[PDB]
């Protein structure tokens, strides 16, 4: 299966450099243009450039002419986008994408996107807290005080999806905080275990917090 693998987040100090990777698998790496797209927090999509891994032919956007440098490594089937002299404007999610036409259909494949955050602050893993309290009962999960973005939240390893509201993260006093609620039948909780699964890739953190009645 065709796959484009990107790291979740990269924290880079102002003025330094970062190199975002895009590992491709499942197809012939040298057959399709590799596109890159920037999306600032809450903004639109911006085209950075494209590179053909066969001969490293590139087409750059003039706005990112000196900023972004696209390379490939064919021994690993990995594409790389290097950003230099980072500023706060360069803090965004960076996607790699390809388009494949096999002679029958045209499919698009996108990486998950790398959240590059340019800041002098250090990484802070989140503090995960259980939110414990008719026919239905609402539970919750408080993911407090982490840096930088992003974090992912699931319930019971993804088995509990309906009735879930995951609220966007808000920056407040240099740290991010989000929450997530889940509403289940009154016979599910507290009879069965309800687990909030939090992942923070920037700090290599995975916390499973049970919603214990107490």
């Amino acid at each position: 299966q065709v796959q484009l693998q990107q790291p979740g987040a990269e924290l880079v100090k102002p003025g330094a450099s970062v190199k975002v990777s895009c590992k491709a698998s499942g197809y012939t790496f040298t057959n399709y243009w590799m596109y890159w797209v920037k999306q600032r927090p809450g903004q639109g999509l911006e085209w950075i450039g494209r590179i053909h891994p066969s001969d490293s032919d590139t087409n750059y956007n003039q706005k990112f002419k000196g900023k972004a440098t696209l390379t490939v490594d064919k021994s690993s089937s990995t594409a790389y986008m290097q950003l230099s002299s980072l500023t706060s404007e360069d803090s965004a999610v960076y996607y790699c994408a390809i388009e494949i036409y096999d002679g029958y259909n045209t499919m698009d494949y996108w990486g998950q996107g790398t959240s590059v955050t340019v800041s002098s602050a250090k990484t802070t893993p989140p503090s995960v807290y259980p939110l414990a309290p008719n026919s239905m009962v609402t539970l919750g999960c408080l993911v407090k005080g982490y840096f930088p973005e992003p974090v992912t939240v699931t319930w019971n390893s993804g088995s509990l999806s309906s009735g879930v509201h995951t609220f966007p993260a808000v920056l407040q006093s240099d740290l991010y905080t989000l929450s997530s609620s889940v509403t289940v039948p009154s016979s599910t909780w507290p009879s069965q275990t309800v687990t909030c699964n939090v992942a923070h890739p920037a700090s290599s953190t995975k916390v499973d917090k049970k919603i214990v009645p107490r």
């Binding site: 639109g44 999509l45 698009d108 998950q112 807290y129 408080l142 407090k144 509201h165 989000l178 929450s179």
Partner: protein, 212 residues
């Protein structure tokens, strides 16, 4: 640089009906125009290429039309799953440029919020902090006002509010309000109230707990 100007920042319809979004190019691009759909928290998804041709897996409800400078993306039988921001793009001239994006909205009947309050967990109290969380789920319209009261006194600081986008299932909105105090302040008071003012009721919805 060619500019792609989407006329509307938001487009509104009801479930089952149809919407259309227009995109204006500064110079002629012929038919080399694409359309993208981006749901909250996801990578973009290509819907249309060559102005009118669909990518594999895109339903026929998504129809693109236009040539030259005026392009249109039409979505028929709109469902709550289609809630996203939609972008146009030109790949006729370099640099490739996107539109500003149009977010889809869905009209629906009013809905009163389900409000739930949660005292600070014992885990957080060991850290010296104390956060009271108030969930306001599945209301419409998105406009809502939340006040925090401590023993009757309103606290409009140390509050962190977050709104979800329109729900992909019932087109409602949800809110999370978190009041954070130190453990000392938390133990210096007893009554903690979350007050919600919504259009659906002239009286505020009140969820409270007494630390006692």
């Amino acid at each position: 640089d060619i500019v792609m100007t989407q006329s509307q920042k938001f487009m509104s319809t009801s479930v089952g009906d149809r919407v259309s979004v227009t995109c204006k190019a500064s110079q002629n691009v012929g038919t080399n125009v694409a359309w993208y759909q981006q749901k909250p928290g996801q990578s973009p998804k290509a819907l249309i290429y060559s102005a009118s041709y669909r990518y594999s897996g895109v339903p026929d409800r998504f129809t693109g039309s236009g040539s030259g400078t005026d392009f249109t993306l039409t979505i028929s039988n709109v469902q709550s799953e289609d809630l996203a921001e939609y972008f146009c793009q030109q790949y006729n001239n370099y640099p490739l440029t996107f539109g500003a994006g149009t977010k889809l909205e869905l009209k629906r009947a009013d809905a009163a919020p389900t409000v739930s309050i949660f005292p600070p967990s014992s885990e957080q109290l060991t850290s010296g902090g104390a956060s009271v969380v108030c969930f306001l789920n599945n209301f419409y319209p998105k406009d809502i006002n939340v006040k925090w009261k401590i023993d009757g006194s309103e606290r409009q600081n140390g509050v962190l509010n977050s709104w979800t986008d329109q729900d992909s299932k019932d087109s409602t909105y949800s809110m999370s309000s978190t009041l954070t105090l130190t453990k000392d302040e938390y133990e210096r008071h007893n009554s903690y109230t979350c007050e919600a003012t919504h259009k659906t009721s002239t009286s505020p919805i009140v969820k409270s707990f007494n630390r006692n």
